[PDB]
Design a protein around this ligand. Structure first.
Ligand SMILES: *[C@@H]1O[C@H](CO)[C@@H](O)[C@H](O)[C@H]1NC(C)=O
Ligand SMILES: *[C@@H]1O[C@H](CO)[C@@H](O)[C@H](O)[C@H]1NC(C)=O
Ligand SMILES: *[C@@H]1O[C@H](CO)[C@@H](O)[C@H](O)[C@H]1NC(C)=O
Lengths: 110, 495, 75, 125, 75, 49, 49
């Protein structure tokens, strides 16, 4: 039940598809479907982009898709518009009843 | 669709000519109802709340003795007197001690002795009672639509919560898009709250029988005593000791909290903080589906492609739930969903999420279906791009029948004579069965009240033996049947 | 004491876990087992009395089990 | 549904700072109120949750002896109290919610946990 | 619980009176009587069962007594 | 005189530091670090998932 | 693909930090502090004293 691992930075030209990886353990990410992706713009509170591995909130674009394989969960952005440039944090409800947040990644887009 | 993922889910199939069905709700259990042209619904009793409880008796579980006084009388002078002896907040006892010249009497014999100590309660357990008119059951009706959670909506799920009280026992849930459902509930029979006490001890509460509570061996106040200076039965929590007939001392008998916890075994624990919430009740209702309608029946079949966004999983009840998403042109459309054989020439399984529809394109819908025992194929979509999924169900039809008979017998054991109303649509056979069960349950409750499960098993074995060794065939079979029934009830009791 | 009237058999039983159900299901039977282990002398005499009282074989075993159950629980 | 916190606070090291989150737009008692910190330029960090329905709590092991979380049902406000502050505690403190189950127990989350946050509170030392 | 296994039959009894001898001398019998009063139904059934299982009046009475004493204690 | 203590019995206890761990079905049993310590009373059960 | 570990079995082990405690006859049972740690394997037996 330790911090999930994500690449420090991710970049992708506009219109390309960009993928972020969240690697946990058999209890953090490989044990449960409590994988949620949070988008946080600088100076603002995080925004829940995905939950339940794949599901997204009502107001969240359809360009955000989540996948989970084994102990690794991935977030993929397709349109990759300029408004998609932010820090993306992965989280998971661990088997011990606690919450672990990934280190976070940054999309540069341009 | 909350009723999936719960092991006590139970399926009610069909309605009567009047479009109503009788269903018994329970707190741990959940009910899924399916009618021909009505959508599938999930009913669960979530909250039972008793309001305005009145205390009928306070029991002392940890007493205290403070001011001990004693008075002695010389032999042949009768019993002595203490003015504390007629004080009600003092516990007193009369005994005899050896008296003589050394003691200061002048006669040789037994001299009367009295000792008194002030009885003070340090901890008590409040037994409260609730009027049956003050029960307020809370039920949740969620249409088993297949729609996923919505963040923007004021209600994230489309489950609707309806409160049923004994006075307002008829209520209708308005399920947006599905018409309305009406519940004609009977709270007054769910629990007999005139024979129940809400027994709250220090930080924990139980729902207990009222005669049991009134027959406890502890000091008790009538419940209206704010001063608490007239405890009854004070001698059950003190001991008077006279060893060697020389002195007499009285001591308190120790905190009775653990003894009360042991005496509470077999009592259902109920929350009694921030309201009197009971999570053990059952409620009988008559469900009226006449104003309940399927959503999107006047839609066209989807022509696009479906992708599974949540791999097909098998629930504990022998059905399968899958989550599909739509990539087609028709914004709202009926999802083509069938459970067929490999060659697709026979329909083997039936849908539980009846009329699966795709309201929004980028919004997956998750479908519960009941595949047949063995191999079957879940076909989703139409030929161009159609996705076909295989599945194997590991049971057997005879096994499912045996499991269903076991479940029916178990609900009869729990909701004795009320199980007949769990799926009844009226009918002569149901009424005859319910009446016979009422008579036999009355007899059984008379002849087996206040008996443990081991005693029930012993009596069942004895009755079965008597039936087995019986000259008459009618009495032999009747006694063997009674023995088998009481053996089963003893095995299934005390849970 | 109050613990000797346990509220076990008073009806009122739902499909919800009651207080100390799993623990208290066999605790009395386990008590009887420990008592019979500690007091084998009484069990032999109870068996002899059951055998000498009652003619049928069923009768003797019924008496023996009843006596061995009452003995420890007579308190 | 909006979660509002207190203003940014500056504390000298070794002091105790108490922050609050005010839950409006929803039943406060039916939701569990989580506390998540984020050091400037660091990742988010879960601290604990308070079950506003009955006051139950669970703190992250990294804060078990320092962080205290309390609720005011009538005020519909949750409180985050982090005593024995140190240099490393300079970070924006967020508050996120999560619905508790039908019985207020709150041991399993909802898949959409932390759906609504607060703007965060800045604590410097 | 501990209260279910009292120290009554230990054989360590002197002329000095014991802890709750006066109180507990008749507690068990009083509790059996109260139980029979509250739960009359089982008493009649036990009487019928004892009558059926006992060939002689001694067997019937002894069996009925044992059944009546066991039912409350067994709980 | 000078009796030696033979056995200490607990008549009134208190439970604290309660913790829970869960596993998804068919994945065996969960693990709590507190299970190693013998002063923690622990129990294994199954809940619907 | 992506198997989940169900159980883990010990084939080769080692013992260290062996400690013992003794009690004079009739005085009960010996007590060891390490008896409270579940990574310590323990056994109670009786010796001639
Ligand atoms: C009982 O004893 C206490 C000891 O402080 C004393 O204060 C109190 O007045 C006494 N009550 C009587 C003798 O009724
Ligand atoms: C138990 O909780 C208390 C706080 O009440 C804490 O001080 C202590 O360190 C905790 N111990 C363990 C073993 O969790
Ligand atoms: C056990 O023995 C090792 C040496 O084999 C020693 O280093 C260690 O301190 C001892 N105790 C523990 C708890 O490891």
């Amino acid at each position: 039940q330790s911090a999930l691992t994500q690449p420090a930075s991710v970049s992708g030209s506009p219109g390309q598809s960009i993928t972020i990886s969240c690697t946990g353990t058999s209890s953090d990410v490989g044990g449960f479907n409590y994988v949620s992706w949070f988008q946080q713009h600088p100076g603002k509170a995080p925004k829940l982009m995905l939950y339940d591995v794949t599901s997204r909130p009502s107001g969240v674009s359809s360009r955000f898709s989540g996948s989970k394989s084994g102990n690794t969960a991935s977030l993929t952005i397709s349109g990759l518009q300029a408004e998609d440039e932010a820090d993306y944090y992965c989280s998971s409800h661990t088997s011990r009843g606690t919450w672990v947040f990934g280190g976070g990644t940054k999309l540069t887009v341009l | 669709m909350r009723c999936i993922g719960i092991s006590n889910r139970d399926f009610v199939e069909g309605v009567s000519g009047g479009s109503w069905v009788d269903i018994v709700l329970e707190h741990g259990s959940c009910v899924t109802t399916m009618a021909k042209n009505k959508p599938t619904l999930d009913f669960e009793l979530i909250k039972t709340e008793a309001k305005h409880p009145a205390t009928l008796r306070k029991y002392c579980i940890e007493a205290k003795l403070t001011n001990t006084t004693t008075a002695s009388r010389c032999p042949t002078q009768g019993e002595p007197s203490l003015n504390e002896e007629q004080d009600k907040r003092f516990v007193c006892k009369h005994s005899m001690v050896d008296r003589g010249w050394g003691n200061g009497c002048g006669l040789f014999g037994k001299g009367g002795i009295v000792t008194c100590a002030m009885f003070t309660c340090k901890k008590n357990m409040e037994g409260k009672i609730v009027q049956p008119e003050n029960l307020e059951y809370t039920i949740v009706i969620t249409p088993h639509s297949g729609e996923e959670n919505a963040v923007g909506q004021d209600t994230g799920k489309h489950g609707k919560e309806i409160k049923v009280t004994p006075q307002s026992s008829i209520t209708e849930a308005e399920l947006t898009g599905y018409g309305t459902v009406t519940m004609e509930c009977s709270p007054r029979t769910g629990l007999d709250f005139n024979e129940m006490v809400l027994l709250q001890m220090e930080n924990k509460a139980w729902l207990v029988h009222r005669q049991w509570f009134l027959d406890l061996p502890l000091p008790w106040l009538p419940g209206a005593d704010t001063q608490g200076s007239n405890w009854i039965q004070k001698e059950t929590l003190v001991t008077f000791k006279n060893p060697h007939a020389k002195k007499q001392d009285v001591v308190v008998l120790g905190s009775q909290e653990g003894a009360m916890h042991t005496a509470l075994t077999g009592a259902t624990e109920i929350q009694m903080s921030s309201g009197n919430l009971l999570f053990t009740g059952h409620l009988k209702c008559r469900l009226r589906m006449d104003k309940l309608q399927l959503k999107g029946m006047s839609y066209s079949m989807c022509t696009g492609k479906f992708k599974v966004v949540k791999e097909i999983a098998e629930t504990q009840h022998g059905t399968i739930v899958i989550r599909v998403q739509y990539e087609g042109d028709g914004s709202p459309c009926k999802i083509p969903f069938e459970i067929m054989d490999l060659e697709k020439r026979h329909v083997l399984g039936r849908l539980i999420t009846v009329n699966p529809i795709v309201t929004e394109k980028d919004s997956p819908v998750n479908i519960e279906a009941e595949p047949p025992f063995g191999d079957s194929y879940i076909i989703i979509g139409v030929e161009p791009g159609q996705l076909k999924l295989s599945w194997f169900k590991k049971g057997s039809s005879i096994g499912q029948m045996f499991e269903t008979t076991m479940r029916g017998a178990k609900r009869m054991a729990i909701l004795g004579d009320t199980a007949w109303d769990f799926g009844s649509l009226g009918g002569v056979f149901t009424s005859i069965g319910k009446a016979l069960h009422q008579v036999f349950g009355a007899i059984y409750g008379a002849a087996f009240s206040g008996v443990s499960w081991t005693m029930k098993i012993l009596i069942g074995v004895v009755i079965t033996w008597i039936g087995m060794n019986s000259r008459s065939t009618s009495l032999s079979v009747s006694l063997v049947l009674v023995g088998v029934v009481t053996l089963y009830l003893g095995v299934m009791v005390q849970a | 004491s109050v613990a000797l009237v346990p509220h076990v058999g008073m009806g009122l039983e739902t499909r919800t876990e009651t207080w100390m159900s799993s623990e208290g299901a066999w605790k009395h039977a386990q008590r009887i087992e420990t008592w019979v282990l500690r007091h084998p002398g009484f069990t032999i005499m109870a068996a002899i009395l059951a055998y000498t009282i009652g003619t049928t074989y069923f009768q003797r075993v019924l008496i023996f089990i009843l006596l061995t159950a009452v003995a420890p629980s007579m308190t | 549904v909006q979660l509002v916190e207190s203003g940014a606070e500056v504390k000298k090291p070794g002091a105790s700072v108490k922050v609050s989150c005010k839950a409006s737009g929803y039943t406060f008692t039916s939701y569990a109120m989580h506390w998540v910190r984020q050091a400037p330029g660091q990742r988010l960090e879960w601290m604990g949750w308070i079950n506003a329905g009955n006051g139950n709590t669970k703190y992250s092991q990294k804060f078990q002896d320092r962080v205290t979380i309390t609720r005011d049902t009538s005020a519909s406000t949750a409180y985050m109290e982090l005593s024995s502050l140190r240099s490393e505690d300079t970070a924006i403190y967020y508050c996120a919610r999560d619905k508790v189950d039908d019985y207020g127990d709150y041991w399993f989350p909802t898949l959409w946990y932390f759906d609504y946050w607060g703007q965060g509170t800045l604590v410097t030392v």
